[PDB]
Amino acid sequence: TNPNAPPRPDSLLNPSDALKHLEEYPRGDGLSLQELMDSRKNGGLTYNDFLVLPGHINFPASDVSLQSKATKNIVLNTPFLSSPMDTVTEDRMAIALALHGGLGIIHHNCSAEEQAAMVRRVKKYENYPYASKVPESKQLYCGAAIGTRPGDKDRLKLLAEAGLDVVVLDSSQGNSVYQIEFIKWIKQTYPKIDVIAGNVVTREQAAQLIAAGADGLRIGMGSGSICITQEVMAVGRPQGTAVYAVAEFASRFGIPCIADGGIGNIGHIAKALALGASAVMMGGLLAGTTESPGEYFYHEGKRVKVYRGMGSIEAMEHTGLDNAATARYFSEADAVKVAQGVSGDVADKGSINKFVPYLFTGLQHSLQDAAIKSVSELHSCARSGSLRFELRTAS
Template identity: 35%
Template sequence: MAGIEEDGYPAERLFKQGYSYTYDDVIFLPHYIDFPADSVQLSTKLTRNLNLSIPCVSSPMDTVTESSMALSMASLGGLGIVHSNNSPSDQASIIRSAKSHRFPFLSYLTFLSPSDSINSVADFPAAGCRIILVTESGTSKSKLLGVVTISDWEALKDKEARVSDYMVKSPVSAPSDYDSEQVAAYLAAKNLEFVPLVNEKDGGQVVDVVTAADVDRIRGFPKSGGMPSVGRDGKFMVGAAIGTRESDKERLEHLVKAGVNVVVLDSSQGNSSYQIEMIKYVKNTYPDLDVIGGNVVTMYQAQNLIQTGVDGLRVGMGSGSICTTQEVCAVGRGQDAYAHAHASVMPKIFQIEGFSSDRNYSFAETISSATYLLQLHATAVYKVSSIAERSGVPVIADGGISNSGHIVKALVLGASTVMMGSFLAGSNEAPRAYECQVMHAIITLLLYCYRK
């Protein structure tokens, strides 16, 4: 409006002052809105060649991304990066599992042959699976012959009886190419609680099992306004992390055979001769495979990787939920993340200054000893994005995303996507049970005091 001086600073002026800022150091001023909320498009680029409907990527941590997370992220229009804290064959198996499904959930299926006894799955009720599939060979690679439900299993008195004696033969099934709405209509029309999906072209092999609860879950997914992340092969897109060692070349071969869509070079310092050589190897050996380099926090680092041929950049260098590069190596930039008390990690619970086993500690005191104060890196994202944009290389803001405000700030400052680790850990789709450090501290403290 004429005659009124604008408040605040433009980003260019703010980030030229020679200071490094965290996300919590900056905030955006409100302005005039002349568009409806439903006109906002979240579609973005992950790499030069890969597009996503939402700017969200799950981190390659072994407590965050395996099959279920990768599948769920892709179904919502994002992407999951499978961790490499496993053997090459196991990592490839996770990728195959995620890409083999057409629905945003994993059915953990149990298979038996007709000659097996129910004792083969003695923990059936406890396993969370409510259906046993009976096939000719007892695997998913043969024709479906029947099913055993948990109610049938619970009614059995003779657990040594053969499966063929009590299975429901020739069960109702649906074609494996049905989409979620077709499956929902099929379940409703036949009043079924579940239906196996079979591929008749492969001799009736079981591809999946969909339950009425699964259908309700799919319908409850938020509408992102975009499409699921699907590759040129028509399957869900899945990424994977690899290192920069010679052995990672063999790992990469396994991943490519499994159908991986993009690889992330997982390193706390991306601007190294090892990563440069690995980028060259990937691009020369698999020219159609996109590679994301990093991690970097400066324009100089970014330029080196861009010139080498990366298709995307991962920005952030400690501290994150599991990364301590700044504390250990004194290297990084403007993150100030995870400042914490001396006793913030469980093994140090008894090193609290003034701690005494002679008095009781309140819950609040115990919690405060293990609390992380989270801040993030705004300067690194802004600086790297400014140079990456000139070459058309998208940036992933990586590290410590813990609320939606952090996501918005990262995107406005130039990132195309954000990588989430602790933000997703502990969710139903995460591969491990959530282990709360604070509760470990409390239990350890109680045991210590009890022994005293």
């Protein structure tokens, strides 16, 4: 028998009974999210490996809510976080993105004093109705990243003093005793500063950080545009499967998940959210913008900015597959210093003032096509099997 359709009728059916006959089918058209994200059946999937199937439209795209949670206590009007990278997020980006309803995560490749001064400028900043404002203060929300070394405790204290709302524990692999203990330390020292723990790609890693007290999870290992060629990497996970697996588990505890790495367009954003992510983090997509740090320069007629991985030799010196313009494939500088990312340049993207509304509109249109009015409904329909998917072959 046909497992995808009921037996064919003997004679033509009445078109007015089409909706009744649709209910006789053994399963929905395409795949459920649970069927798509099966490691044994389909392997590890990236965003480009599948599509979301269209649903029913009964609302304009302007009615779509993109409201989501970055952490268990932080609600954002736009599910966009800028990456804590020295060529992506400083105070200018953190302010601009917050004004558009997103959230900036200021990098830590500077002294704790310089970082605290950047956090302070975001918090003190004074047309933008979607603005990410802290409810009782009306100040813009501010995030920042730190490592999990003993000296990071003192760094966080200066950041807390500067008015920090949320902290990102910056790591290629957050499932360590060092990060687990550091989370517990923040939960006891600063209970009001939300903790985004990671990076994680497995359910087992997520469970450790959820139990430690993480308020949000940063998902991704090897997915970044400036990440060393994956043919050179041994440990990681394809981003789609990573986003699904972690959020499938984390959502049971109400812990929002941030899809970090490999977001190159609106489609990637829609797909990451459709997989269970509550928000996305962008490095590459926000690099080369006016609000990003670093100077513009010309490279063979093109106006560019440097965009680099934080594990690149250049970023580590205290001063790679999918990528825009150019890049250099470095591997080592010191035998002890193993490069984990690349340094290159990205073309001028203009201001985020024009770019972020484009991403916002495009995402409302994508959710409308899927028949979805909110991120909450997107997730609910993904878990129920109402929201359908289809794998795409090479061609």
